[PDB]
Amino acid sequence: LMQPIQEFKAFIESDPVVHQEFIDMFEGIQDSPRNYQELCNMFNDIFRKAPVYGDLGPPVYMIMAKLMNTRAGFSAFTRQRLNLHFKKLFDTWGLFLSSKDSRNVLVADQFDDRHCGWLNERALSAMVKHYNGRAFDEVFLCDKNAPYYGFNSYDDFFNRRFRNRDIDRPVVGGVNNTTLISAACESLSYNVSYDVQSLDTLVFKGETYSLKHLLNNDPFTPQFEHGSILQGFLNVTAYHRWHAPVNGTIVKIINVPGTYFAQAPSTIGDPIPDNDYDPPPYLKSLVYFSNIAARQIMFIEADNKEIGLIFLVFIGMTEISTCEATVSEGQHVNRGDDLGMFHFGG
């Protein structure tokens, strides 16, 4: 086992309460992983190779979902001490996913009955579903004649840039109209909430925002009391970069450590569907865990004074939880410019 997994296992064993949680969470599980030792062994496989196309979510989520859906698992996964280890595991994995060796999934090869490479036409088709008949190599900047479509790693492919946003994803109304706020991420609508507030605990009102938590007690928090929040979900095959939603100035960027595998407690025990039209408990938890997940908060001062101070929160989910800003505090940006991107990592 690679050293980070060793230290992870040693931590589980170092505290009898944590250890007990990593036993009870497996109760009656007949499939692999059946205990925390098999979990560690499967991590050791997963972190040495790049993900493939086919599953409903990324590979760590897939083997974790049954555990996350228990009380014991939620307890374990809401300890900052344990989450420090998940961070180091996923950061270690992300190293490999930035390396030339992770290109081997950037192929058309079918790998088994249910999985294929990312350049297979099944996957190529899925990734341009919302681009109105344009093809993958038209939409995204790549080389369709090169091996691995020209990407130098999996992360490079995951964070592929648009070849020509003015055709496929235009800044609607033009950068000069400052009365408009753009979507920051290619996503699906998940929740809108009005008159948002702060809560003293995140209990029994699951799927409610708590500004104080979401924004990690920032001094700006009171300004957003009674305001509104729109939240989107990015599919695993979606464009994963961030664009500036307004012309404005970056006021403040805060990186907040948090959870990776915490679903909403109200959903613990709900069925985990064996299909894809039905959302599993974790994907019904995005509002809840925006309060506590590893995330980056970005405050922007819109050039249009009638829009003023806004915030963005980029919210991690399981192994896709690294939030890289490519802008700096004080910098000016126009609607549609890069703010940063998501990566596999902690």
Binding site: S187, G232, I315
Partner: protein, 34 residues
């Protein structure tokens, strides 16, 4: 996942079609307007 936050004093209003979960959000498209 991502979230956009607007102040109450902000005269911009989220575009109503996005209050329905599952609606497609094309990056750079308008999600709120004055």
């Amino acid at each position: 996942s991502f979230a956009l936050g607007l102040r109450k004093d902000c005269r911009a209003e989220i575009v109503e079609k996005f209050t329905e979960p599952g609606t497609v959000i094309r990056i750079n498209e308008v999600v709120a307007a004055l």
